[PDB]
Amino acid sequence: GCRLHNCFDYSRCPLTSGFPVYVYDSDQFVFGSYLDPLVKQAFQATARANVYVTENADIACLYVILVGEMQEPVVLRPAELEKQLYSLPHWRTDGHNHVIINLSRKSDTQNLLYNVSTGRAMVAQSTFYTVQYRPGFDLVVSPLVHAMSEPNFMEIPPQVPVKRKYLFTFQGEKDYDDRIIATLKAVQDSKLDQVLVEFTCKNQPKPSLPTEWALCGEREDRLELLKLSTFALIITPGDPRLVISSGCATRLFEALEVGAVPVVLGEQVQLPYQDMLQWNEAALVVPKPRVTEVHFLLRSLSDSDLLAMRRQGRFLWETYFSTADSIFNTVLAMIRTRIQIPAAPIREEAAAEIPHRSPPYASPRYLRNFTLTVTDFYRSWNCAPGPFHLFPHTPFDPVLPSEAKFLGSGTGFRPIGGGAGGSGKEFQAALGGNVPREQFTVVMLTYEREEVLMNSLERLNGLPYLNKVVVVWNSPKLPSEDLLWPDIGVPIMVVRTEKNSLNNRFLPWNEIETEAILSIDDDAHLRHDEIMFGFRVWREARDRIVGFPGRYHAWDIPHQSWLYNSNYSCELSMVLTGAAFFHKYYAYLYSYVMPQAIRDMVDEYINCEDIAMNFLVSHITRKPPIKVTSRWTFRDDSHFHERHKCINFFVKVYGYMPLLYTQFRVDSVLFKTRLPHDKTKCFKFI
């Protein structure tokens, strides 16, 4: 009967004190010796490395104890388990602010807590009965599969082609049941489209609950078939008291792992994390009575919608199901969100500044703590990257309307002509636009090119809105002390790198105090006017990459593969970061959230960092980049083919090609315009 408003203590959790968590060591209790070794090892490992965890049990909001899946047959009796629970050091009489975790790996018929009294503690497991499920208080979590193993993406088939060999498939063994079976057998016999339905397992059926469809064979024997199926069928148990079973969750897990779109029969099912996720975007839920209309309904859906559901299912699996770390973090995030506390800030890249011998306005940070966790609930949980981290800024922050600045919210706004507009004279005196005053920061790599560096740095003398320059010394040896660095009116900071890697230009250096970053090589030539216009455009397009150099990708029909092209073209799909603007948000994503395989390959092949960044941004936004000017050059074969390989490998990772074509570029409004002599152009060469 408990709900979060009456069996949880909020006095231990001020909004401002963080979210400390205490984990009981189960080796110090009777549970440990009977726990499944893999579950225990994985949980201990992930809990050791998590950031919210602490050892000071006096300050913790939340106490975590893993009773887990125990070795079969179960030895402990419910009374013994209950006695152990109430004997815990901090199980104050009723056991408030405790969460009990029971992860399922091997047995789908184990229910430890059915006869146990948990007091006011919360329960997290993959199986439930209505008598023991308390919505809004308890949690439904995915089973632990990849214990001590890597959910590598290499085995996953591509998201394309859309249709596969089989429309839908099923494999199970056990008054709507008979009608369902007859309908599906008829569909198979009709051979309008191929299907494969089996109601008897040749491999000895796995143990199951009394009225549940049993799994056939091993995990691999099921995946080898799901890989060929467009839709995956999931029939819920006939028992009305069975809210959710580990078997159905296992089927859902397996289906999402290989891109088969779940189709669920039964509206009364509680899916994992359902109070946070919109499973309608990733799965189809159909009532059993409508079973006779499923074939037509599936045939009706278009390729684009199905592909979108497959993509979203991939995201959900990779983010909440793949690993034990993900599951534990998700549990903590759910509990934190319910009690309305913000997430932990993400880590910066603290750096060592190399000394050398020769107003800045900083952007305010962390202004939307509550809003992201609560108001942006849907975007936070159902859109990439996810809810686990808190960022100082985001490019998706809402922008005030025009009347706001003139009516009370004008802090930092610099209107053109005081709100009256104007030509270049008024245009160049103020940024204008839809967001407040802002600056940008420059980031430049260097490797064995010392003198050109000094000249290029000198070329930056006089930029209006420059905050500072960050030089990334990517060479093994320190710069010579005879080297006299110039002065350009703003600080120049040199940061040392552990080792040479192109991934160091996208690190979130602590020295960067601006949302915007101008990624520029040490040998590139750019005029002041170009940079100003690019900065303004970025201020209008914070979520995009805004850069001068352009490229495009092409199809190779003979080999059914992609290519990297650099010719002059009427359409583009990439903008290299050798000269480009982007938000620091993507630096965090690249460094920490993006898959490690891409970074490792970039280290291996010292090329291909910009391509990865374009892949990332197009994946997040689904919008192409922006090109700003007519210039194409700003001054080998292996370097060329390495990039073909890079593109193909990145596609293999993401599962699809996220790049998008654009057939236009952006120039100033009054560009090449015959003005009257009462007006002046915004720029002279733009």
Ligand X SMILES: *[C@@H]1O[C@H](CO)[C@@H](O[C@@H]2O[C@H](CO)[C@@H](O[C@@H]3O[C@H](CO)[C@@H](O)[C@H](O[C@H]4O[C@H](CO)[C@@H](O)[C@H](O)[C@@H]4O)[C@@H]3O)[C@H](O)[C@H]2NC(C)=O)[C@H](O)[C@H]1NC(C)=O
Ligand Y SMILES: *[C@@H]1O[C@H](CO)[C@@H](O[C@@H]2O[C@H](CO)[C@@H](O)[C@H](O)[C@H]2NC(C)=O)[C@H](O)[C@H]1NC(C)=O
Binding site for ligand UDP (CB under 6 A): 445-447, 449, 474, 500, 521-523, 578, 606
Q: Which stretch binds ligand X (CB under 6 A): 235-243, 289-297, 473-481, 565-573?
A: 565-573
Cβ distance to ligand X smaller for residue 54 or 561? 561
Contact partner at residue 565 from ligand Y, ligand UDP, ligand X, none, CB < 5 to 8 Å by partner kind: ligand X
The answer to whether the annotation marks 614 as part of a ligand binding site is no
The answer to whether residues 466 and 440 touch, using CB atoms and an 8 Å cutoff, is: yes
By the rule CB under 6 A, 563 interacts with ligand X: yes
401-460 residues near ligand Y, rule: CB under 6 A:
none
The answer to whether residues 382 and 281 touch, using CB atoms and an 8 Å cutoff, is: yes
Cβ distance to ligand UDP smaller for residue 63 or 473? 473
Gap between the Cα atoms of 307 and 312, Å rounded: 9
The answer to whether the annotation marks 449 as part of a ligand binding site is yes
Cβ distance to ligand X smaller for residue 304 or 567? 567
Tokens, residue 165: 């060999």
Contact partner at residue 644 from ligand X, ligand Y, a copy of itself, none, CB < 5 to 8 Å by partner kind: ligand X
338-357 residues near ligand Y, rule: CB under 6 A:
342, 345
Tokens, residue 134: 């308390």
The answer to whether residues 122 and 145 touch, using CB atoms and an 8 Å cutoff, is: no
- Which residues are bridge partners to 142 per DSSP? none
User: In angstroms, what is the minimal distance from the CB of 583 to ligand Y?
Assistant: 18
Of 366, 378, 406, 632, the one binding ligand Y (CB under 6 A) is 366
The catalytic position among 25, 94, 610, 636 is 610
Strands 579-583 and 546-547, how do they pair? Answer: antiparallel
Contact partner at residue 3 from ligand UDP, ligand X, a copy of itself, none, CB < 5 to 8 Å by partner kind: a copy of itself
The DSSP line for 592-603 is IIS-HHHHHHHH
Contact partner at residue 303 from ligand Y, a copy of itself, ligand X, none, CB < 5 to 8 Å by partner kind: a copy of itself
By the rule CB under 8 A, 663 interacts with a copy of itself: yes
Of 216, 276, 537, 598, the one binding a copy of itself (CB under 8 A) is 537
The answer to whether the annotation marks 390 as part of a ligand binding site is no
Contact partner at residue 331 from ligand X, a copy of itself, Mn ion, none, CB < 5 to 8 Å by partner kind: none
Closest CA to 422 of 225, 98, 675: 675
Cβ distance to ligand Y smaller for residue 345 or 595? 345
Gap between the Cα atoms of 639 and 647, Å rounded: 13
The DSSP line for 186-217 is HHHHH-SS--EEESS-SSPPPP--TTSPBP-S
Of 523, 529, 540, 667, the one binding Mn ion (CB under 5 A) is 523
Residue 412 exposure: Cα atoms within 13 Å on the Cβ side: 12
Gap between the Cα atoms of 612 and 53, Å rounded: 33
Cβ distance to a copy of itself smaller for residue 289 or 491? 289
Residue 295 exposure: Cα atoms within 13 Å on the Cβ side: 16
Active-site residue flag, 325 = no
By the rule CB under 6 A, 394 interacts with ligand Y: no
Of 227, 389, 644, 681, the one binding ligand X (CB under 6 A) is 644
The answer to whether the annotation marks 636 as part of a ligand binding site is no
Of 336, 599, 627, 643, the one binding a copy of itself (CB under 8 A) is 627
User: In angstroms, what is the minimal distance from the CB of 517 to ligand UDP?
Assistant: 15
Q: Which stretch binds a copy of itself (CB under 8 A): 72-80, 180-188, 209-217, 412-420?
A: 412-420
User: In angstroms, what is the minimal distance from the CB of 520 to Mn ion?
Assistant: 10
The answer to whether residues 402 and 434 touch, using CB atoms and an 8 Å cutoff, is: yes
Judged by DSSP in three states, 325 sits in helix
User: In angstroms, what is the minimal distance from the CB of 342 to ligand Y?
Assistant: 6
Torsion angle of the four alpha carbons 302, 308, 309, 310, in this order, in degrees rounded to the nearest 10 = 110
The answer to whether the annotation marks 523 as part of a ligand binding site is yes
Strands 561-565 and 550-556, how do they pair? Answer: antiparallel
Gap between the Cα atoms of 650 and 652, Å rounded: 5
Q: Which stretch binds Mn ion (CB under 5 A): 11-19, 171-179, 259-267, 515-523?
A: 515-523
Q: Cis omega before residue 385 (within 30°)?
A: yes
| DSSP code of residue 591 | I
Q: Which stretch binds ligand X (CB under 6 A): 271-279, 300-308, 509-517, 554-562?
A: 554-562
User: In angstroms, what is the minimal distance from the CB of 104 to a copy of itself?
Assistant: 27
Gap between the Cα atoms of 144 and 39, Å rounded: 8
Closest residue to ligand Y: CB criterion? 369
By the rule CB under 6 A, 555 interacts with ligand Y: no
Closest CA to 212 of 246, 179, 256: 246
The answer to whether the annotation marks 221 as part of a ligand binding site is no
The answer to whether the annotation marks 609 as part of a ligand binding site is yes
Of 35, 520, 572, 608, the one binding a copy of itself (CB under 8 A) is 572
The answer to whether the annotation marks 445 as part of a ligand binding site is yes
Q: Which residues contact 655 (CB under 8 A, 6 or more apart)?
A: 153, 156, 158, 159, 259, 311, 314
Closest CA to 65 of 78, 47, 83: 47
User: In angstroms, what is the minimal distance from the CB of 632 to ligand X?
Assistant: 12
The answer to whether the annotation marks 102 as part of a ligand binding site is no
Cβ distance to Mn ion smaller for residue 268 or 501? 501
Tokens 């914070």 locate to: 542
User: In angstroms, what is the minimal distance from the CB of 160 to a copy of itself?
Assistant: 5
- Buried-exposed string 143-171: b where 16+ CB fall within 10 A, e elsewhere: bbbbbeeeeeeeebeebeeeebebbbbbb
The DSSP H or E segment spanning 121 is none
404-423 residues near ligand X, rule: CB under 6 A:
420
Task: Could you list the residues known to form a binding site for UDP-N-acetyl-alpha-D-glucosamine, using ranges.
Answer: 445, 449, 474, 500, 505, 521-523, 609-610, 643
Q: Which chain residues interact with ligand X by CB under 6 A?
A: 420, 556, 559, 561, 563, 565-567, 644
Q: Could you list the active site residues?
A: 610
Q: Which chain residues interact with Mn ion by CB under 5 A?
A: 521, 523
Task: Could you list the residues known to form a binding site for Mn(2+), using ranges.
Answer: 523
